[PDB]
Amino acid sequence: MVTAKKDENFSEWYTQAIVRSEMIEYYDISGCYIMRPWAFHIWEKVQRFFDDEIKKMGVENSYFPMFVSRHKLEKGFSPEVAWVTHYGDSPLPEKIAIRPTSETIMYPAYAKWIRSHRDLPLKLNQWCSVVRWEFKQPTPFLRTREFLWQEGHTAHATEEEAWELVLDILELYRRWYEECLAVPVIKGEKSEGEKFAGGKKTTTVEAFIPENGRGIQAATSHLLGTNFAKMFEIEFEDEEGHKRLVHQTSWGCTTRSLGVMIMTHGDDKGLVIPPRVASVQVVIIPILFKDENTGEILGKCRELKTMLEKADIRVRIDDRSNYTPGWKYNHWEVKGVPLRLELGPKDLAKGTARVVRRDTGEAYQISWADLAPKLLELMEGIQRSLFEKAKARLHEGIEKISTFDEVMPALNRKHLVLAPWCEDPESEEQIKKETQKLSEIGAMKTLCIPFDQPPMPEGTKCFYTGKPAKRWTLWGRSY
Amino acid sequence: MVTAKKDENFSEWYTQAIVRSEMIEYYDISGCYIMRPWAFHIWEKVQRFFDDEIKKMGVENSYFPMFVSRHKLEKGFSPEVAWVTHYGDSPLPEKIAIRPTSETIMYPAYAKWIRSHRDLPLKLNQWCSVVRWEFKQPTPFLRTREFLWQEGHTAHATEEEAWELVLDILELYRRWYEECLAVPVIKGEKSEGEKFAGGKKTTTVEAFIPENGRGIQAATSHLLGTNFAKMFEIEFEDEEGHKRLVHQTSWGCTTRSLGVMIMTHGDDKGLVIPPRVASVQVVIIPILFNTGEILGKCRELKTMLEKADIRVRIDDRSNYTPGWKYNHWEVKGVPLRLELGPKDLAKGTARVVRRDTGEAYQISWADLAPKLLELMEGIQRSLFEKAKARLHEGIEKISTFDEVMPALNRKHLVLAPWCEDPESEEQIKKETQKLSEITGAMKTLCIPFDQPPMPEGTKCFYTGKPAKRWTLWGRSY
Ligand SMILES: Nc1ncnc2c1ncn2[C@@H]1O[C@H](COP(=O)(O)OP(=O)(O)NP(=O)(O)O)[C@@H](O)[C@H]1O
Ligand SMILES: Nc1ncnc2c1ncn2[C@@H]1O[C@H](COP(=O)(O)OP(=O)(O)NP(=O)(O)O)[C@@H](O)[C@H]1O
Ligand SMILES: O=C1CCCN[C@@H]1CCCn1cnc2cc(F)c(F)cc2c1=O
Ligand SMILES: O=C1CCCN[C@@H]1CCCn1cnc2cc(F)c(F)cc2c1=O
Ligand SMILES: [Cl-]
Ligand SMILES: [Mg+2]
Ligand SMILES: [Mg+2]
Ligand SMILES: [Mg+2]
Ligand SMILES: [Mg+2]
CATH class of the missing domain: 3.30.110.30 (C-terminal domain of ProRS)
Known part of the structure; x- marks a missing residue:
């Protein structure tokens, strides 16, 4: 159970929320944390969303190596690079870096693969981890020394096409935060001081954490121009026969998005998960005490589950015998399951269930036949309500x-x-x-x-x- | 074109097939290779299959760090471990290893999370890459210094339930190979000499490469017994308050499976990709040397095939003859080519050629979706059964x-x-x-x-x- 108050010590609240919900386990290597299944399932949801969407754009997934040779990498970032220097007791002839980002790994191949306009646009992405020896204070999800991300890197014949992709990706990131995670973001362009120096223009979506007044970059999408094409000799021939530089973009978004969701919707009881990314949308709890109706309670629970699944509702029956009903309410609450459905003997007789929504704590008495459509209605309510309260807090900030x-x-x-x-x-x-x-x-x-x-x-x-x-x-x- | 003959110069055939199909790009760090979309798509396919299946068993995904401290890792394999000693110009207080496998990272967490019989069974998996500075000659897919895999690690209250899981996972590896990749495998128990020394019994699926006469371990599934539970102090109180050791399993399968599939089905022209995992199942090739008549029809055919969940690409490239295209998609191993020229447009038909045998079929437009589904099932099955007979002839x-x-x-x-x-x-x-x-x-x-x-x-x-x-x-x- 969560005891620090979100509005008092924020950092202690966040730590408690992520540990007690079983999202994060701490680890002996500083700046790195274990993502337990309850957090990982959420990453799977946003991952499947973004990935489906970029595939409609013709973006293909790939996998490039996690190592890059000293000299390729080294053609204010240097202090962050992790270096492999040995295998067993043997020193490497030349030390090798773990990928902080993959420009130096991908762009030489791009130079090789692109020969003419027939080869463009080239659109690649990869889901992978990157390593940066962050100097700022680490924080689970938000700033970690190893993080999961995708990075997309595209190459086009013209700036107009490249720029159009930049904005398309940016809109996908708006949708990742706003539509999946119910977190509002502001689209904008970085100042000259904040943009990626390798690029022409950097676009961003920015979020806001009211409790500490901190702005936070949610994702990023760069119009790279042609500088990388000049540096890596990424050239092609037009349909007229002349040698032209490609116009490139890159974009990435990380498990930071999960931390932003946690901080945005969490309350004093811990996590609140938006229904769209909740792996358990509805937990069903059988109320069992002094052997009263044990078998008939469990039976109708299975029946309700099958019914709710017809409507594509994600349902778990917590029928574990070694935990009390009250332990279950607490467990799933701290875990942020959007709807709890309770079924005891009294409820059983009535053809009704009691349902409690996690965001506001409002309880509903609902008849078995009204369940599917009432729950769908509640879940759209929760999702839209989470977003709109976050939006209003953003604008008050x-x-x-x-x-x-x-x-x-x-x-x-x-x-x-x-x-x-x-x-x-x-x-x-x-x-x-x-x-x-x-x-x-x-x-x-x-x-x-x-x-x-x-x-x-x-x-x-x-x-x-x-x-x-x-x-x-x-x-x-x-x- | 592929020119090395698969039976006569197998090693050069392999290199040619994976590079010229655009599966693999070579790379300056030894034993590391770029996986381009044509290969990577197949990985996403088997991953989606295996992941859907283990989720049915209640296995849940997680992500543990790629770094393990020297002290934790070192609680035979030592020469393979890659060690990070510096960040920028600064030395670490102690070297840190890149994960060659995750036991030493996961099992201390398991010792913390498992306290009681009600915490059991615990069933985790992760998809990630691992690094091993392999001493043997590197081979794209089959033996690489970085490889992609999943590793599953579970803990049970009893050996019986652990063993049940070991076997269910092994059956899933059989499915991964035989059903997705059409590669036949042989379930078996490793000898005492070959088993994971950290476990009690190792089960395996073994495959055979006829061209070089070599067996190859396709995936692995271990009954670990209670020895890691002793080692890491993974214990639980049973129902009577007694401290017991958990019974453990672990299992893994890698991008090696892609290389086994390539070798099994390829021929002198190049790759043959089983329809269940091919990025493109049907390539539509217009016979052109535009008015809009032929392309227009190709788009209509594509749309109609995509309705049946067939993965289609139209090769409408300007600079290439049809014959050049035929070869291009053959080397890539697209299982089905659909040819559409003026004579076909004129007759309401299309000519379809299957990659595995080169048999051609005349098919009316209306019939295309059902006939192509049926051809794909026939190709998938026929790939498997010919590879099965070659295994047993071997x-x-x-x-x-x-x-x-x-x-x-x-x-x-x-x-x-x-x-x-x-x-x-x-x-x-x-x-x-x-x-x-x-060797x-x-x-x-x-x-x-x-x-x-x-x-x-x-x-x-x-x-x-x-x-x-x-x-x-x-x-x-
Ligand atoms: N250490 C990190 N851990 C988690 N997420 C990160 C980390 N660094 C960056 N991100 C996120 O990944 C996105 C793309 O990374 P990138 O644009 O390379 O970051 P960056 O320029 O280093 N930002 P910053 O570290 O604040 O200077 C960023 O917009 C962040 O949302
Ligand atoms: N270097 C590698 N590259 C690709 N796949 C590999 C590699 N090493 C092992 N595999 C595969 O991953 C599976 C599980 O790994 P593991 O059981 O740890 O391998 P292993 O004991 O090291 N086998 P071996 O290296 O031949 O002695 C193996 O059964 C192989 O199918
Ligand atoms: O922000 C993106 C999206 C993904 C593609 N890359 C761009 C710019 C990444 C900015 N960045 C960010 N951090 C870095 C850290 C390093 F150690 C290093 F060598 C390079 C970088 C670095 O280039
Ligand atoms: O069989 C598997 C796959 C899934 C779980 N992991 C085991 C691998 C265990 C055998 N093994 C195999 N190779 C290793 C290489 C290393 F560098 C190292 F430090 C350790 C190992 C090592 O333990
Ligand atoms: Cl070496
Ligand atoms: Mg940074
Ligand atoms: Mg910055
Ligand atoms: Mg080995
Ligand atoms: Mg061995």
Whole structure:
């Protein structure tokens, strides 16, 4: 059972939620954690969703090696690279790196495979793990030294096509968070300071954690332009016979998405799992005490299960004899199962079951015949309700502002700011260092420049420099 | 085109088939290979099959870290372990190993999670890669330094329930090979010398490669007994409050299965992929050297076949003749080619050619979906049954040690009555090695579940002592 309160010590709440729900087991190698089945089933759901969707785009899965040779890799990231130096007691002739990301592993093959327009677009993805020796404080799911992800890497004849894929993938990430995990996200573009330096333009979806006021990057999708094509000699011949550079994209999203879901929907009793990604949508609990009707309770439970499955409802009967009914309520609650159905002798006689929804704790008396459609209705309710409350909290957490003098107070309130900005280079660093300084007495950075821009009245000035502002940019402390 | 003949230069045939089909891309780190979509799709297919099946048994997926501390890992195999000693320019406090297998990572967690009979059975699996710095020559799929696999590790209150699971998992590996890959395998028990030394009994599915006469272990399923439970202190209180040791199993199968399938079904033109796992089951080739008439029809045919869950691609590439395309998709092993030219358009028919035999069929458009489903089932089954007959043509039943070298020289396995005493296996290994020299060694592959009749008073082929069971032996991978 969870005892830390979400609104008091947040980090201790998160730790308790993930351990006691049996999502995570701690591990002796710092920054790495065991994903137990209750968390893994969720990853399988979002994984199957994203994967199905990219397959409709013609993206194919592959698998490239987890090792890259020193010299290929080495053609502020260097301190993060894990190096294999020995096999048994023998030193490798040359040390070898574990993949922090796969550009240096995939792009030489791309140069080889692409010869003409007939070879494009090339669209590949892989699901795998990557290793980065993160210097920031690690946190399960959100920042780990080994994490699971997919990375997609595509190559196109033209920028327009490449860019169209960038946005398509970004929309899939919106759907992963918003439609599967009921977590709202803001699409936007990274500032010049925050974008992937290997690319032309980096797009993102950004989420927000109210309890610590932290913005967090949810996924990423890069228009790479042609710089990688120039670096790796990825060229093709047009249908006219000339040699052209390819236009590339890459995109990735990780098990971080699970941590974001946990933090968003969790409460003081622990986990709350959105029905769309819950492996157990409805747990059925037989109420057994003093031998009253034991066999008839269990029988109708099996009957209800079969009925609910016809409607594609994912149902588990917890008929384990070595646990009390009250232990079961607690167990499945801390685990965040969206609906609990209880069946004792009193309920049995009536042709009804008592059903409790995990998000609000509301109980329903429902007749056996109304079950399938009532539960489907409740599950859409839960899913939509989880999302809309999270959305309202996201919007309560963002403050529209005009001047730097408004910044520090908004941060103390654990909010982000949407502020007009000239998008100058020195600016962001200045702002980072200064909010850094005022906080110590930490830093605030740009999260993104939202795609959805409020109007910009003529003559409005950059909130920091005083110069003419360009667009509204979202800022805050972040992960 | 593939030019090395499969029977005459098998090693070069293999390399040619996997590269020219675009399954595999070579790579600068030894024993590591890129798996391109044409190969990877097949992996997703067998993975989806095996995963769906173990989920029916209540096995649940998880992900344990790829790193294990030196202290945990070291609680024979030592030279194979890859060690990380630095991050960037900084030395670690102690070296950390990349997982060559996950026992030392999982079993301490199991010792914590298992306290009571009600925690049992515990049934976990993971899909991941493992790394082993193999000393033997690397071979794409069959023996790689990084490989993809699943490993299942379970714990039970009793040996009986553990053994039940061992056998159910082994039956699933038989299915993975025989049903998905159309590769016949032989269930068996490993000898004392060949079993996992950390377990009580190892079961296996064994396959045969006729072109080089070598047996190859296809997958493995172990009754671990209680020794890991002693080692890691995995105990539970039973119903009476008594501390008991759990009974364990583990099992694994790798991307090696893809290479076994390639070798089993390939021919001189290249790959033949069983319809149940092919990325493309039906390639539609328009006979063109556009107005929209032929392509238009190809799209309609595709749509109609996709309605029947047939995986289709139209090869509408501009720069290539039909004959070039035929060969291209043959080398890739697409089981069915659908040809559509002006004469076909004119007659409402399409010509279909199956990759395994080259038989051609004239089929009306209306009939395509049902006839192609039926051809795919016929191809899948016919691949299996021809490979099955080749497996059994590759095994010689013998009585005496003098029958051995002639059998091995015919690139055949041998089935012989064996007394199963510990020392004779090593002796047979050494003796067949030395005779070969005049990887030549003959070892046991498995003691098959399917035991041929054993006449009363039959002697061990080697020691002459009384013979227990028939054992299958051969050169192997
Ligand atoms: N260490 C990590 N653990 C888990 N998820 C991560 C980690 N690092 C990055 N991510 C997520 O993976 C996505 C793509 O990774 P990438 O864009 O390479 O990260 P990044 O540039 O290193 N971000 P950051 O580490 O904050 O500077 C990011 O948008 C994050 O959502
Ligand atoms: N290097 C490898 N590459 C690909 N598949 C492998 C490799 N090593 C083992 N396998 C397969 O994975 C299965 C389970 O692995 P395991 O039982 O640990 O192998 P093993 O005991 O090392 N066999 P061997 O290396 O021949 O002595 C084996 O039965 C093989 O089918
Ligand atoms: O963000 C993506 C999506 C997946 C493809 N890669 C891009 C950029 C990745 C940014 N990134 C992130 N982290 C890294 C860490 C390293 F150690 C390293 F060598 C490189 C990187 C690195 O390039
Ligand atoms: O048979 C399997 C597959 C599923 C569970 N794991 C076992 C492999 C155990 C045998 N084995 C096999 N190979 C190993 C290689 C190593 F480098 C190492 F450290 C350990 C091993 C090792 O234990
Ligand atoms: Cl070496
Ligand atoms: Mg980073
Ligand atoms: Mg950054
Ligand atoms: Mg080995
Ligand atoms: Mg061995």
